[PDB]
DNA sequence: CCATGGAGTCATTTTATCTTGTGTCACTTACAGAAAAAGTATTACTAATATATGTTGAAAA
């Protein structure tokens with residue numbers, strides 16, 4: 230995804246570098262709300278809270 | 280400067296208001312103003328005072 | 330990637346817990362590193378015009394509030410065609426437009442070419458033609474597919490009132506996909522059937538709106554629409570099911586586009602048809618078009634409009650052409666007989682009237698043919714399948730384009746089953762690619778067949794030999810009306826006196842430039 | 852260029868001149884390891900030192 | 901030979917800069933107009949799709 234695409238492809242976009250964000254911290258925490266929503270530009274967005 | 284390139288080359292009869300071209304030329308007023316009020320820094324190009 | 334200095338562990342887990350940030354493999358217990366380093370806190374021929382490219386692009390792009398994203402995407406496409414030098418000799422607007430357009434098409438987002446083209450003087454054949462050409466030079470194939478389900482939302486935002494519209498939207502969709510199911514969806518503009526369903530469900534919404542207000546988003550005619558209204562009215566369970574319960578009937582009926590019904594009103598095994606063949610013939614001597622064209626019954630010479638002289642004849646129902654250099658194109662030929670033979674007839678005019686001009690350089694260029702399979706066809710699936718070899722731009726033009734290099738021909742495809750073919754260099758290519766792709770026809774069906782023989786009728790060289798091939802043999806094909814095909818001398822004088830009557834200003838300013846050739850001195 | 856005159860141009864000689872950096876704010880002032888930071892609160896029952 | 905006067909000679913003033921400003925966190929965000937290359941679009945045609953536009957119009961209500 231980082232590089233310059235061409236319209237030449239076959240199968241695998243399947244390569245995914247994953248950077249799941251750890252919750253660091255000095256103590257336990259809870260998640261009481263999460264939000265799947267979109268801005269004007271029509272791209273998925275998640276803003277959550279602990 | 281926009282309507283200029285309209286009246287450069289007078290092929291046939293060009294009027295067609297060149298209005299909806301305000302869209303393409305717009306929103307530097309709008310979005311630029313957003314960027315301003317979010318920045319915290321104002322650039323005044325009339326006085327060159329910032 | 331690396332591996333432990335000892336345990337030979339390849340799996341590295343980085344502990345961030347204690348805020349050491351130290352990476353170790355669960356196979357050893359030795360970190361391979363200490364304290365990972367981290368960060369802190371235009372003169373070109375091409376690239377200046379590239380700043381122009383984004384500039385004009387980014388400018389004209391989001392005037393439609395299209396995604397900032399997709400614009401960035403299309404820019405690299407402009408660089409792609411820029412590499413092919415597709416960007417050289419054509420109006421930059423048509424280019425920058427098409428560039429953006431391929432993206433949104435590839436991303437299937439709600440905009441329409443006819444919609445998007447409007448931000449200028451565009452006749453939409455301009456840009457559509459451009460986009461079509463960059464397709465000819467780009468192997469990008471199947472991605473730009475369309476349905477109204479996209480458009481209807483962006484339409485509803487212009488439709489005001491309330492949110493019953495949204496409820497109504499779901500109405501239209503089931504309607505829409507059913508109309509896709511009822512097989513009338515094909516061969517017409519997505520905007521038309523879109524606003525069609527939008528209306529029909531608004532009439533289902535018991536509101537008062539206008540075709541005007543509809544085409545306001547749609548940008549088609551009214552008669553356009555209501556031809557599609559009645560195009561629903563004639564259907565099965567049209568008014569019979571038109572009542573409430575949101576059309577619980579999902580059932581198909583038949584699939585019968587209006588196309589072949591026109592064959593009904595006008596009313597493999599079917600052999601394809603010769604339409605016309607493009608040949609050419611060289612005379613060999615450049616000569617005055619004016620003086621020679623002065624005597625003919627069939628002539629037009631107007632360099633103000635088109636340079637050369639127009640050759641046309643009712644017999645054998647042909648046209649051909651002439652050049653100034655002593656060449657000509659041969660046209661209006663359904664077969665090779667009337668082709669080379671009449672080609673020899675046109676030389677009887679000159680060699681009778683004008684200069685030497687033998688019969689030389691007879692060469693085929695294009696060949697045309699047509700056919701019909703007498704049943705409706707699903708074209709989109711073929712484009713969904715053979716779109717690598719196929720080109721379908723929905724309502725950009727109803728005729729579907731197919732691309733085959735073996736043999737090398739573009740194919741002319743239709744739901745009606747009427748199929749036309751040209752670009753062929755050979756009569757046998759007709760049956761080659763024709764019945765070659767017919768198993769694609771009978772292959773694609775919903776719910777005669779025998780090719781007979783691959784080649785039956787005589788070849789091209791046979792009918793070419795049926796004509797006298799010797800340039801010096803002339804009077805043999807003279808109809809004796811070619812004696813008559815020349816006008817008399819006074820017709821040349823007085824007629825020419827009139828044509829020069831207008832054209833002495835054309836030839837005048839011509840001679841005025843020729844006089845400026847004297848002004849070359851000073 | 853862009854012709855906006857951002858400001859951000861110097862900082863090689865100025866790199867080792869003032870404030871936080873090489874002059875005497877980073878090298879003479881080196882940032883340190885094996886440390887911690889907290890707030891204060893008494894324990895008289897804790898001995899001096 | 902000594903005198904005035906001039907010419908160098910060197911103190912000396914008042915200008916017009918250039919540096920620096922206690923240390924610490926919280927997060928931190930080019931210029932316009934020229935000449936050339938060139939390739940493309942018209943500008944002819946047959947030549948067959950079936951939309952789309954229109955207009956009109958004529959007929960029908």
Ligand SMILES: [Zn+2]
Pocket residue numbers: 332333334335336337338339354356357358359
């Ligand atoms: Zn290891």
